[PDB]
Design a protein around this nucleic acid. Sequence first.
RNA 1: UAUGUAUAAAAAUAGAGUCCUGUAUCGUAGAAGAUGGGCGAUGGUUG
RNA 2: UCUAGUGGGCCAUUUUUGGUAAGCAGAACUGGCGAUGCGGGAUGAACCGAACGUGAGGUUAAGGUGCCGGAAUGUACGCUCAUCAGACACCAGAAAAGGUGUUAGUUCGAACUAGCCCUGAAAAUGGAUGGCGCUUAAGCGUACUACCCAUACCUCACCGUCUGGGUUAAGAAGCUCAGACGAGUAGGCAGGCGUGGAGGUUUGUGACGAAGCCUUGGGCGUGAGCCUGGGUCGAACAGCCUCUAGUG
RNA 3: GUACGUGAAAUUGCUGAAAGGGAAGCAUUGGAAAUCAGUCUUAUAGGUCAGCAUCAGUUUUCGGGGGCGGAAAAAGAAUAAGGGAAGGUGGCUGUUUAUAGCCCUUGUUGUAAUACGUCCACUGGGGACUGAGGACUGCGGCUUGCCAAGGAUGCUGACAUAAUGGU
Lengths: 146, 51, 214, 196, 117, 168, 106
Amino acid sequence: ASLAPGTVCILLAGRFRGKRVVVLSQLEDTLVVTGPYKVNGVPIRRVNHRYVIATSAPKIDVSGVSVEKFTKAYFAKQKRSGPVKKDEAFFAENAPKNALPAERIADQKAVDAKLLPAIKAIPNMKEYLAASFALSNGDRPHLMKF
Amino acid sequence: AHVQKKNPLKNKAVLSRLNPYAKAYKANVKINSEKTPKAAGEKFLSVLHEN
Amino acid sequence: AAEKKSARQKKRELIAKRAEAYEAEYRAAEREQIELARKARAEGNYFVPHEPKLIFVVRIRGINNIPPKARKIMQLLRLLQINNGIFVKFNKAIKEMLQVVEPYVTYGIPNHKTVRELIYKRGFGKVNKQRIPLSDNAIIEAALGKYSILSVEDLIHEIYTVGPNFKQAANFLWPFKLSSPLGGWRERKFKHFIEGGDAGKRDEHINGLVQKML
Amino acid sequence: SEFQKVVVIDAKGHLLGRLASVVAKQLLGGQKVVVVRCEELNISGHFFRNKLKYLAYLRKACRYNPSRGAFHFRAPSRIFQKAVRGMLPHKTARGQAALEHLQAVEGIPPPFDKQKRVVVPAALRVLRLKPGRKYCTVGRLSSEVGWKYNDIVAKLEERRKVKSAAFYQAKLAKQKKIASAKEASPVNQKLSQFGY
Amino acid sequence: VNIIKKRTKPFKRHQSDRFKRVGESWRKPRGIDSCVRRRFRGTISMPKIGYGNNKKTRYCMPNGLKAFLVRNVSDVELLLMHNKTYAAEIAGNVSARKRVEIVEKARALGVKVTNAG
Amino acid sequence: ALKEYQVVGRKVPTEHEPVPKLFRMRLFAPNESVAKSRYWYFLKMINKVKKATGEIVAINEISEPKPLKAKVFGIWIRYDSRSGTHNMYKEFRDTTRVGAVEAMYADMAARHRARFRSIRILKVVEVEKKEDVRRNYVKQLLNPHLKFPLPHRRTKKVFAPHRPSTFY
Amino acid sequence: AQGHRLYVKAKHLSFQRSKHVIHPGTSIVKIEGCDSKEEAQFYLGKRVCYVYKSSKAVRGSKIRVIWGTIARPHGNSGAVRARFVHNLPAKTFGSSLRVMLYPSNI
RNA sequence: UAUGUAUAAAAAUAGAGUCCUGUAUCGUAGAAGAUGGGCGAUGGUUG
RNA sequence: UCUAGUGGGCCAUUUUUGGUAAGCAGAACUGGCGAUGCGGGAUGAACCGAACGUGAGGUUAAGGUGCCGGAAUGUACGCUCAUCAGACACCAGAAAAGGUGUUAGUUCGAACUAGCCCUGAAAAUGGAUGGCGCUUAAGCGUACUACCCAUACCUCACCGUCUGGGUUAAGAAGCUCAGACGAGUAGGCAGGCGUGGAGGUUUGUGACGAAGCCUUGGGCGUGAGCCUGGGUCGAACAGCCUCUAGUG
RNA sequence: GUACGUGAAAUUGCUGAAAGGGAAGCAUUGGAAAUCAGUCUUAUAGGUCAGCAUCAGUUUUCGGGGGCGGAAAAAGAAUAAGGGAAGGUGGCUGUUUAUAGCCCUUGUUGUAAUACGUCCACUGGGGACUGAGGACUGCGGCUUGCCAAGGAUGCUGACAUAAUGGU
């Protein structure tokens, strides 16, 4: 219930662990979630609902951005059907520089610009999103409320 | 037949199969229609609070 | 083709009507006892509730170090294992039979939920000398159909109200193989219930025990 | 519950068994424990009874080669270690390796006199013994059964206390300056509704 | 239905570790004072019928096939009808020539060989 | 866990006694089963009526009428010991009869090593007049100006950082 | 440097045992700050891992990890029970485990 | 075996220098922590 | 119907005989041990709980939760201070009488009656509440929750036995569905494994390496055992059906 | 190579590997090191290990709503009366609500509430183990198709590895 769209949640696992991101829409199993890429550098990704902590931070207005174009086929990888993989040239491929179609670039830019006005309106949210969540000495997760 | 025993209490479909009456049961019925005429004789009260 | 299903549908409706009548009988009897108690209290007299005719007996001691008389009696009660339960009529012959095995069994008055939950969760029938779960009404049809017991709810009514066919219904029911009680027994299990133990007659507290063992 | 890399325990006013049981469980948990000021440890019961108990301990020895027989250590740190050793499975490699995580000393040597020393409420005499119950100190018990460095520790502890007191006055002055400059900041009220 | 084994370690004979005249092959202890026969705690366990494996996966190799001993090409053609149930296994005493003939027949029959290499 | 029970019963009707007398007792037991058991125990020893030839005609639980008023209860008991020749009268200050009886049971067990079977409670009564109280400690609690320091302060988290103040 | 550690420190106490019989399949884990079964209810189902370092670099990494899940509480003091994919070695008594914050439900 | 490898009064307990423990204080925002700029301070962390 | 083994017994409860006594001799009823593991009693043939196929999960018995040791340094009210306290049945042993010990009670300051403690109490290698230790207990009495875990109970998977229901469309000596159960010495019976020789059989293996032997290799079976890779070797040997015995 | 076919075990020397604080050996479980095979590689379907979802069976753990029962809880509150004494308030050690109050009895609000007992074929979460069977049959529900109804599928990713597993 707490994973409403527009909520600020903390990524627990993955390469973006500890980042704070803004939930856009609820997919069938996961959350199509992204922090404003100009803020924390987290592009649009699916994140399983078991790997987020829904914080009690004030909600972000995400009604003004279309979310129906984010589907399983939208985020799906390419078919392989073959055991042969991996190469130094393969690692040189993909990457942010190659692949990453300009259509994906434009959507990320569009949704990013649409979410700036809300986070600028609410004070101390831009720095809150840019920061990274972390546990310190004497912090008990079953006590603290997010 | 009957490879697995399904508990009727925890399985509504199996409960329906065994009991074609759970569909209309109505367990909670307001019986005291908000009136409650207390009935305890004075002799009973004296014996209760005796000694 | 469809005649069998047409007859089966009205058979199912008849089962529903009989179960509806049984629930009305339970409610009417329970309310009748309450009103009689209230009127006796209001008028200053005493009204004694009827002595239980149905009893639920649970074996609590293992199969080791038991005298021959008690061992035979629990064999006649079909309580051959620890944590085994049976429904039994309460009369002069039974009361003295349970007196002998007081240290090895605990018995008390079962209520409607105890009987119903036992027969639904742990209800098994003795069909062709086999322990067949009561997963369908047709199983009781084939075993107690000639006794006018047509459904699980009819079987519950026979057990709960102790009808004329209690013996056949009770013998059809395979003895209940209950689990160990959640929360544990009392500190010393093999005293008498009056002494803070758990053997012997425990009146309505067999219900609290059965809820734990289910 | 909390895990520290090393725990320095001020053994003053603590009960021998109550502290040894707490320490022994912590050592088996994989935590390094240092116990300081073992000469101030307390034991329930009057001294004479405790002295007789230790004299009973001295009686145990091998009838051949007492050098094989039980080694009766007199130092208060060694008495505390003996109590802990009887609470650890020391014949086993697990309980033996848990012993070298324990370092009981008399007084507070230089490496530990500059470190925070926590106490165990579950083992404190004031919180455990009814007032008016006689008790003895391991330091005095040791000094009568053979320990011969009682007054040296007392002198060195007195000097350490003076030095620690002078440090505390310096820390108090610094903290007083910080507290005085604390209230001047306007943020102190901006943090008020947050409970800080 | 995946292949599972109830037990993987063998049943060695009691004290076969301590005495060389006592081989490891299992022997039922008949002693009047045997700890293993009386099944004391910590002692070694004895073969029981409860240890038996599933009738469906019994005798099957981890790859799901049953090794079948083969002497010549006639034994390979016996596995013509069951290349998906039995795998041919050439005997020890088969010469190099007949071995090559067996493997070539097994490949043509599409029958796996457990000791092809 | 005790509960005060009023149990009324009588012997079964017979030709010799068409109208048997009804005997009622107020007795404390953890549940109704023990209450009836003790009730037959006392009748069996006094009036020649067995549970076999008798019947419980009424069972009732008595709740304290004024549980929010501090009272003094005087209890007469027939203590049974190694010699078994003992009558005790004790006074306990409590707010309910059940609480006073439970306090009596613990006190007898602690001081005289008496079990639930050894003790039988002859009578529990409420002492309303202060001058009727003969126990010095109860009268000390009846001192108008009663006031005393809080005893046994005692106040997981092992390894506290500071020495406890354990004071006021 | 305090911008990491998204897990909770824990210590491997022992195996599920009686006085004389152990069950290596299930481990007893003591989570820091958890002092009762009510607190342990939060940590039920979390992923607890044992991290260790070895000489040979499998996957070109010096660190190996044994994964596991918290199953149920143990006792009244907040210790829990864990099932690991490979049972924990008996030498890891008193070793430190890492209880991640996922699978989350908060 | 580390993930903040953070914390130094002595005391008494029918008293201590406000108390009724540290759930506190110190530290904590930045590609595992980037590249630039404007104001403010003349402090802070570190070779 | 035919036949094996046995025809030395022992312990506990209660009843009891002879006996100064006995871990003594002799009986009566029941349960155990012998023949029987497992959890608890520190440890122990018969004590307490529970009786055992291979495992997973859950829950319990007796007993326990300061540490050793899995589990509350729990809650409530008390008693106890012991110059060698106390600490759980069987059980590892103690008495009369006492106390300017203390806490309570009963009766006329006094006599008492009851609990705890102490005295009575008195041995020989150093030493045992199991150890450490424990004193508003981690002792003793009582109540109350939470918790720990047996091969016991419960659900499930698999193995075997037995039992019952099907199967003329399926090595019918086959196939298929279902339930219950699983300790074992002396002893019985059944089905299998392995060894030497004989009749039949396999277009059987083999000097391009039979048999045998060694092997930090691989596979099958509950097991007896079988198969196989590598090495060594040098002339024979095996599977199936049956026969036989100087067969483990 | 006549100390001659094959050349076993006991026992022995050398080499390599590891262990060793008053025995050793053994069983269970995993780490470490060594070693190895299956499997895939292919012909929409399939190899190894994982994560979530929706289900089923078993169980555990928190929470909510409701019905019924008892002296139709006992109490209590507010509000009307009577009576009472104190461990005595104001007034002067003594008295009877005053410049505090308490207790006892009775009515009204009241058909009060809460606790306890009990039941719901009432309901909201969290965790764990298990997936046996293999076209269709049945008993049910829904509306002919569907369904949690006679035992697990669905959607994905990583690795295709010594990964899992074996020794």
